[PDB]
Design a binder for this molecule. Structure first.
Ligand code: SF4
Ligand code: SF4
Lengths: 539, 534
């Protein structure tokens, strides 16, 4: 029957930010850009004409500025990570390491991170914003300019078929999300999203049984360990409870990690509105600090901050989104209006935020090095000096085809440790472009096979690894060293001296490189006995 | 300046000329075409958005696509389909025939209202698109015999039903031109829940792991979202939401006309070869269209995407048997809406045990214990009805030391939630609700003396199977999806007893006749799904 029914109709938008036009953000205008606009009035309504050339130009300051600078809230976290008495020493060192990288990047020659990311555009074209309609082509051109004329990295791999792939050669196409919105302006958020943090976007399908403090707290405790250290913490953690579909939930959790939703309300209503959840944002941070995971190597600063947005849901549904912003916190707001192009101003003076080292010579027989490494327990910090072999997914895959017919393991797979990494482009007159590690766990499947054929005894990367790497190292007497994640520019400037392609030339950044390093920082993570320095915080 | 743009998605029919559209009578009166600065523009009375959205989210609950219908006839015409496959597919065709009377919707789950809108550069709406589309949905759902399925969160844990099926998911994209194109999807919660994302690696990208992965992953869909499934698989993507958005649209066939070859500039393509490999496992899995057989799935879509070198996202999502999406567009001639097939009967190829439920459960348990799992049966008599809120509430009642609800001890428990009742009808659409979402309560409740006889849809955990074997219980599987034909033909009387504030989740009392179900788990350790997970 009808007795709990209702009455009149009231539209309430799901997203109701209190700062819809991002007035809380400081913007700078692109000089002379009033030449791109003309005030008109049509059918009694005011409209705005935009030269589509502006999109290439606009997308190119944003996708240039953003690879060298961070937002103040990211930077405040780094100053804070150093000054907190409760931060571990390793937090401070990593934050110091991360802070030193950011200072190098502001020189505009070396990019702040090695993984210069996927180019993502969120666009909102006003009803009366007239661009000529070629928005997508010109925006893609601006990213291309940033990536063609600067020392960034091409990270996107096109699939010619299921297994045959080729590089696009310019890190294009971009993700262009152009939304239709009210008004006559054009608003943008540009995001250069690292693959590592894009990969740390997880979807779980849960139920109402989850929606209680005890279960949800336990869920967050349980699931946070699965984020690990593989996306260069401190993290901005975003958690989205509810959503009208998985993809909408994941888009929402993506933007929260990007602080796009910071000005939402903090209470729900009977009409179903998004809200920020301060209590559960606080709860996420409490879990992060007590987790002991720390800034890559143990401590309190697993996370800068957290955003938790509660959304409405279908009775049959409970989508949940979890996503991070990484150390390379890279986003930029902008808008176009009758006065021209305005672009979020980032902090040009990072300096106000500015406040165990055992040398291991790798230029020795690897058997002497294995013996020395075998002398120390996991968690031991080290500084590496000598030759590294650089190889990641495609180089591993190329190496795997030889290995797949059961013999021989190529000799070049047996002489040196395998460094999972991919460098950014080398600036003119510089020895190396940005060059930090990439997540070890993704190459985990190659170690046991290679070790069983007498190679890949030592691997070097970032991120927690699977039991197979621990098991492999214990059986064969191997070691895994973790470089600091994020400081790609200062490693290249001070530590990385030469890069040459060794194998698989047809590949791009994913070829095998041979490099010689000095003062390369790492921790002994896995020893030759079954030990793993993450076994307590990451099980 | 050696730059060449290649869109990721390059459909060969981006405006869906292959789809048939009808003009809304008189809708040319709501628009007037103008030309500004040498370009063509369109003034649109936003009532067109309401009208389209209010007809779209009415029509789509009563009719299906031909490619959907063709699948059921194929399931009927295949000599290798099981008998149980053919009955369900026939029932769905019969349900569609029941639904075509335009009063009862084919499913009780009127879905999440999803609108994909694509506003051309020179398409001018007045800017209140969101308000006017939402107004149209409210009209469709307020004035029709649908269901209000959206639950507003007052805080993180306190929830209430919104009472009108709003808000919708409105993904309005900016594209070239001056027209307005739409795909409307009424997405059931059960299948929305059965959209899974896995983070895999290059190590997957070999025949054995991917084939095995597909074998492994297909089973995790189970039968809990009312198969036959349209299965869409997307390998790669630039972000989770893009992988999941793409697999959603592929499963709704929005991307069916993509190219079949890739290129060096990074474009999506369909891979027909791997669709065939997915289907053989689906058929040989034995999971079937809910109750065993070959027609676990109607068809598959597999799209290979570009990827970040460090990444290999994989998205899996389905459109269920209640396949409810409608393409539409607004142009210079008025409002055009995809014309669906209004005579589904043409897809029908024209060329048991009487159980008295009005007894003590001990007589039924003794009799039922005599039969093996997998038997099709037709039930006649009393069912006790309880779902999500009652399930959450029943655990809460027992936690305050009050054991087992009065209504849980007198009758077999039928897990279900009704749609609104049409004037003069005994019942609105009244199909089952997924048992699996309540599994964590199931072991507790049976161990505490309740839920001895269950009737629902979906695979259940081994603990539920073990319980019926341990306690001499039975789980009966209703067919999932045919909510309308059960109400018209099987359910004769329904009365509300307590807790009306729960809406669709209130307690109801119903009398049924010729109610079909399967013996899924018996009281002897047998489970008709035991072969689904090998
Ligand atoms: S900081 Fe770490 S997670 Fe972020 S883009 Fe760089 S390597 Fe990837
Ligand atoms: S077929 Fe099943 S899962 Fe799909 S909408 Fe209908 S009731 Fe929901």
């Amino acid at each position: 029957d009808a007795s709990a029914v209702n009455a009149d109709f009231h539209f309430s938008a799901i997203f109701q930010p209190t700062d819809p036009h991002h007035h809380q953000t400081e913007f700078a205008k692109v000089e002379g850009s009033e030449k791109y606009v003309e005030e008109v009035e049509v059918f009694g309504r005011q409209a705005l004409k935009v030269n589509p050339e502006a999109l290439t130009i606009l997308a190119h300051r944003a996708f240039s500025d953003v690879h060298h600078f961070f937002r103040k809230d990211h930077l405040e976290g780094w100053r804070r990570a150093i000054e907190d008495p409760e931060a571990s020493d390793n937090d401070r060192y990593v934050a110091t390491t991360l802070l030193k990288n950011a200072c190098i990047a502001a020189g505009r020659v070396l990019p702040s991170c090695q993984d210069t990311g996927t180019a993502i555009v969120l666009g909102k074209r006003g009803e009366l914003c007239w661009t000529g309609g070629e928005d997508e082509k010109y925006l893609s051109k601006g990213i291309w300019n940033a990536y063609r004329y600067h020392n960034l990295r091409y990270s996107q791999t096109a699939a010619l078929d299921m297994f045959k792939e080729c590089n696009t050669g310019d890190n294009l196409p971009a993700q262009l999300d152009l939304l239709a919105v009210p008004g006559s302006d054009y608003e943008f958020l540009f995001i250069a999203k690292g693959g590592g943090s894009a990969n740390k976007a997880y979807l779980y399908q849960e139920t109402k049984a989850l929606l209680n403090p005890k279960s949800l707290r336990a869920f967050i405790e349980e699931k946070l360990k699965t984020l690990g250290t593989a996306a260069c913490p401190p993290y901005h953690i975003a958690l989205v409870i509810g959503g009208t579909s998985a993809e909408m939930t994941m888009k929402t959790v993506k933007l929260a990690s990007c602080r796009y939703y910071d000005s939402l309300p903090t209470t729900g209503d009977k009409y179903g509105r998004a809200f920020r959840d301060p209590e559960w944002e606080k709860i996420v941070m409490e879990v992060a600090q007590k987790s002991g995971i720390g800034a890559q190597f143990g401590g309190k600063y697993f996370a800068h901050q957290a955003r938790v947005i509660r959304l409405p849901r279908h009775g049959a549904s409970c989508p949940v989104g979890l996503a991070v912003s990484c150390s390379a916190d890279r986003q930029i707001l902008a808008h176009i209006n009758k006065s021209g192009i305005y672009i979020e101003q980032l902090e040009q003076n990072p300096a106000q935020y500015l406040p165990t080292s055992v040398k291991v010579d790798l230029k020795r027989p690897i058997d002497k090095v294995r013996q020395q490494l075998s002398q120390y327990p996991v968690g031991t910090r080290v500084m590496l000096n000598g030759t590294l072999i650089v190889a990641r997914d495609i180089a591993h895959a190329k190496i795997k085809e030889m290995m797949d017919n059961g013999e021989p393991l190529p000799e070049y797979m047996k002489t040196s440790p395998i460094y999972y990494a991919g460098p950014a482009k080398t600036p003119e007159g510089y020895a190396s472009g940005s060059f930090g590690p990439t997540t070890a766990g993704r190459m985990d499947s190659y170690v046991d096979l290679f070790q069983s054929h007498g190679g890949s005894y030592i691997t070097l990367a970032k991120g927690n690894r699977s039991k197979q790497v621990t098991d492999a190292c214990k059986k064969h007497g191997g070691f895994y060293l973790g470089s600091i994640g994020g400081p790609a520019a200062i490693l290249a400037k001070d530590s990385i001296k030469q890069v040459t392609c060794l194998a698989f030339p047809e590949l791009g950044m994913e070829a095998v490189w041979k490099i010689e390093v000095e003062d390369f920082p790492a921790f002994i993570v896995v020893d030759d006995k079954g030990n793993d320095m993450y076994s307590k915080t990451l099980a």
